[PDB]
Amino acid sequence: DNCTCPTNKMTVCSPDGPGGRCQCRALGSGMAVDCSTLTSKCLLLKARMSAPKPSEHALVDNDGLYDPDCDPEGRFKARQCNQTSVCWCVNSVGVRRTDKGDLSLRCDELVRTHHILIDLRHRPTAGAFNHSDLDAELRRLFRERYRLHPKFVAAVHYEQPTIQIELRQNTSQKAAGDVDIGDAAYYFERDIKGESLFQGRGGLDLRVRGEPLQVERTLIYYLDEIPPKF
Amino acid sequence: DNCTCPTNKMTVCSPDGPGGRCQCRALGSGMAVDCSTLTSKCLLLKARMSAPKNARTLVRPSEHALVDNDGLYDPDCDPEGRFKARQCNQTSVCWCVNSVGVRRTDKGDLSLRCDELVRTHHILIDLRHRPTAGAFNHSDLDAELRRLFRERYRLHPKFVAAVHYEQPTIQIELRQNTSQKAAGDVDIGDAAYYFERDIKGESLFQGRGGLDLRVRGEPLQVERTLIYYLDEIPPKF
Amino acid sequence: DNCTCPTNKMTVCSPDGPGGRCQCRALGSGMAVDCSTLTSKCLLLKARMSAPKNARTLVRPSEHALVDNDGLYDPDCDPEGRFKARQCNQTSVCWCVNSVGVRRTDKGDLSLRCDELVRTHHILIDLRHRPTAGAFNHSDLDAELRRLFRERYRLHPKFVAAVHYEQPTIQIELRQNTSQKAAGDVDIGDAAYYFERDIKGESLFQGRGGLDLRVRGEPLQVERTLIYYLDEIPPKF
Amino acid sequence: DNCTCPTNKMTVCSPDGPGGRCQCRALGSGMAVDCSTLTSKCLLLKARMSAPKNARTLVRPSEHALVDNDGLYDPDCDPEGRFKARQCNQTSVCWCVNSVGVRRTDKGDLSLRCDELVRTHHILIDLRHRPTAGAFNHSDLDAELRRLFRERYRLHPKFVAAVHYEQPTIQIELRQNTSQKAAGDVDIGDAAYYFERDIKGESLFQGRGGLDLRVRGEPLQVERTLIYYLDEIPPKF
């Protein structure tokens, strides 16, 4: 009864559907969105890279960001070109998994990313956190906030400052509508850097047993079912 | 209440959104759809061919099989839902299209550049109806055809240039420059598509299957159909 | 009975023959017609494509217009009623067709030579029907589509290769090589056409005129129909 | 009084020095750090890649894992803190880099030499901010992005070439030639880097976690960032 899209703020909803039914479409892609679970990373990248329309010419760092082509199911397309003739292949996370080729390039399958290492560093505290609670609370987080099944958070390590979350999802084990670790990860990263994609609960508090857990560095490593070809 | 997309049957809805909210998406395209007005031709062409996901007793049309309509094809649509100016389907064959999606140029290679999406501004729909003992009154035809675009196809009555009528063969002119298209005016390309799809009994409306098309009580059954598209820029062949 | 051609409505019958005999000629072709079985597609296309003359009020579409003719055209038909292997419309542009009449070669000039009438031996009819609450009993469906082509379109059961079924989309495979078609075996390409025309509500039968198309009582309404044509020799493009 | 390195949080202090003297050192490099001005970019990359000494429950990213950013790496930094003009990471893969860190030549082998540290004299900072009902006033924005670089990133005014503003977009240009960079003048490369890290929520300053960016009171959040580096010598690809 309120034309909002909680799970994806990168969208335009307006109650112009039959009877006031809230219609809501993805920003940049134009695709339909499901405001009950996570939106695919590919369509969220399409939003980031809207590209409405002064110039320069240089060398450039972009953080690996670009406007991808996403299939009807909203995942990445195996082949991915951004400039005119530079093309390559990507994994389910849409990172480059080959040497940039030419417009003839042949990518034959979307190689699944099945393991993701999230290494977080946290603002050191006088008293480090209880491993038990830190684990318990990170597992809750992925379960409740990112709607990821507990069976896909493989492990949660904890030493002084650096924290690590391992995610495992083979293709053999992802069923209908299971949220992808690819996307759970991305929602986490956005949250961590304070750009939460959630339209209404915006903000990652992330406090363990009351004490807040500020994160200072974040690195994410994608392991694919097939090793890249460089 | 009930998940319907009454302006585009070629969709998939369900009450699976926030607090039961009816979500609904475009078959094949996977794109978002406005269930309160017409859907862009492109989003509907994508839905037509549509490659069912797991065929699973089914068979796929052969590499060498061919259909009655050369021009039929699975297009690529931009985020606004209109045809991308350039349309490659074959491995290394590209072309440019107009706003209505038909081919404007000689087929090409993957280096091709289509600079703008040339606008189709005039459309000519050339129906022929299975004869009755006589003809009808042109008056009643113009009235009815203009009423259909006006109510059913939600096309502002200013964009029906003319209706012509002779022994049997009927004609409907549509005119819409890009200057005269306001916010959310339905396109004539879209209205025309909906019309033909209905004329040929693959209606895209929820409750309907075809076009009734009765004039002053007498039903009007349509044997032939021809739809000529005129572009602002003439096609380079 | 009465001067009626039950298998082809696109005709004029009158009892102007010897001793009030019923003579009946085919509209647009002028060809004879066998009112006991299906007429050839080529002759039915000719009927649809009359294109009457003298065009008083009607507008001539454009010099610079693109055509959406659904592949339809006025074909030339050999004295037996099959498609001429060489087809040229509107003048001076030609191509070769197959037994079903679709283009099989790149368009050509008035020197083009079409060796033979390459046969269409496999027809895939992909249907899609109005989703019900559930599905139908596959058995009953396959039984009723087999019965339909057998009784209605007078096609021999041995030519309906398969009948597949899933959620909504329904497929019907027909296979008739040249090596296996006898004298007065109705063609698959013709039964196909008769099917499509009935599917899209423009029945060709003079006196039934209705595809009830119900399976175990529940009616089967068809939302989308694609027909794929596989030739005994691949096309040359 | 309190062991704190406000200008670089990626370090380790302690009062283990002469008479309790606070001693502090950059993570991952073990280099000395000026806790009053910016630390060099090279020294920061080094600390991003720290790989803590013994994991000892932790795991190490595989030899095959990749990251989002192909140009993140662990650089070698000269004893002054700037990048070594030649960088290998792989077993047998070396290239050359600019004053800011990015590969400016083809990827060579272990007998590849690089014969100067090619300066980066002009940087383009492109930012897109999250939409608001309307724009800002270009007089306020420039008044602040110049005040921000001035005080926080401790960069001398005369090096902010320009501040632009288009539809959401904010161009910031930075110029610093070798001939204008005096001693203890913070490099632009190291102000540009500190900026992005704040823009993108990995701020390097002790107190802060991100960048507040309130122009006249309205907070400026930033969905997209693009940074373009121009080198005095053009890159030999």
Chain A interface includes B33 (CB < 8 A): yes
Which chain B positions have a beta carbon within 8 Å of A21's beta carbon?
A: 21-22, 35
Chain A interface includes D66 (CB < 8 A): yes
Domain boundary among B88, B118, B148: B118
Q: Rounded distance, CA B54 to CA B60, Å?
A: 11
Considering the domain architecture, whether residues C128 and C231 belong to the same structural domain is answered as yes
Number of domains in chain B: 3
| Signed CA dihedral, A192, A196, A201, A202: sign only | positive
Domain boundary among C118, C146, C175: C118
Contact B194, B211 (CB under 8 A): no
Domain boundary among C118, C135, C160: C118
Which chain B positions have a beta carbon within 8 Å of A30's beta carbon?
A: 31-32, 77-81
Residue A205 vs residues A150, A197, B94, B172, D159: alpha-carbon distances, Å: 21, 14, 51, 63, 38
Q: Rounded distance, CA C38 to CA C190, Å?
A: 7
Chain B interface includes A42 (CB < 8 A): no
Contact C30, C18 (CB under 8 A): no
Q: Rounded distance, CA A27 to CA D166, Å?
A: 20
CA distance D18 to chain A (A): 24
Q: Which residue of B has its CA nearest to A52?
A: B79
Encoded amino acid at B204, one letter: L
Chains D and C touch (3+ CB pairs under 8 A): no
Considering the domain architecture, whether residues D150 and D204 belong to the same structural domain is answered as yes
Q: Which residue of B has its CA nearest to C124?
A: B61
Considering the domain architecture, whether residues B159 and B232 belong to the same structural domain is answered as yes
Considering the domain architecture, whether residues D50 and D150 belong to the same structural domain is answered as no
Considering the domain architecture, whether residues B68 and B181 belong to the same structural domain is answered as no
Strand pairing class (A79-81; A87-89) = antiparallel
Q: Rounded distance, CA D19 to CA C190, Å?
A: 103
Taking Cα atoms as reference points, which of C180, C186, C178 lies closest to residue C150? C186
- Give φ, ψ of D198 to 5 degrees: -80, -45
Q: C-alpha angle with apex A11: A8 to A16, nearest 5 degrees? A: 120
Question: Which structural domain, as residue segments, surrounds residue D174?
Answer: 119-237
- Residue A1: CB partners within 8 Å, gap ≥ 6? B19
Q: Rounded distance, CA C143 to CA C215, Å?
A: 9
CA distance A1 to chain B (A): 8
Considering the domain architecture, whether residues D101 and D125 belong to the same structural domain is answered as no
Considering the domain architecture, whether residues B47 and B112 belong to the same structural domain is answered as yes
- Residue D135: CB partners within 8 Å, gap ≥ 6? D165, D167, D168
Considering the domain architecture, whether residues A54 and A10 belong to the same structural domain is answered as no
Per 3-state DSSP, what percentage of chain D is helix, strand, and coil (rounded to 5)?
Answer: 20, 25, 55
Exposure string for A190-229, b = 16+ CB within 10 A, e = fewer: bbbbbbbbbbeeeebebebeeeebebbbbbbbbbbeeebe
Q: Which residue of A has its CA nearest to B7?
A: A18
CA distance A176 to chain D (A): 27
Taking Cα atoms as reference points, which of A174, A161, A166 lies closest to residue A142? A166
Chains touching B (at least 3 CB pairs under 8 A) are: A, C
Q: Which residue of A has its CA nearest to D49?
A: A219
Q: Which residue of C has its CA nearest to B171?
A: C58
Chain C interface includes B129 (CB < 8 A): no
Contact A79, B88 (CB under 8 A): no
Q: Which of B21, B31, B45, B84 to mutate to test the interface with A (most CBs of A within 10 A)?
A: B21
Partner-chain contact B30 A5, CB within 8 Å = no
CA distance B150 to chain C (A): 23
Partner-chain contact B164 C227, CB within 8 Å = no
Which chain B positions have a beta carbon within 8 Å of A13's beta carbon?
A: none
Q: Rounded distance, CA C130 to CA C153, Å?
A: 24
Considering the domain architecture, whether residues C78 and C167 belong to the same structural domain is answered as no
| Residue from the list A63, A123, A166 with its beta carbon closest to the beta carbon of D69 | A63
Which chain C positions have a beta carbon within 8 Å of B198's beta carbon?
A: none
Q: Which long-range contacts (CB under 8 A, 24 or more apart) does C20-28 make?
A: C28/C74
Considering the domain architecture, whether residues C131 and C169 belong to the same structural domain is answered as yes
Contact B16, A36 (CB under 8 A): yes
Chain C interface includes B200 (CB < 8 A): yes
Chain A interface includes B79 (CB < 8 A): yes
Contact B176, B159 (CB under 8 A): yes
Chains touching D (at least 3 CB pairs under 8 A) are: A
- The SS3 assignment for A47 reads helix
Considering the domain architecture, whether residues B127 and B224 belong to the same structural domain is answered as yes
Considering the domain architecture, whether residues C150 and C80 belong to the same structural domain is answered as no
CA distance D214 to chain A (A): 16
Residue A199 vs residues A5, A24, A119, D78, D178: alpha-carbon distances, Å: 6, 13, 26, 46, 47
Taking Cα atoms as reference points, which of B134, B169, B163, B168 lies closest to residue B150? B163
How many other CB atoms sit within 10 Å of the CB of residue C210? 10
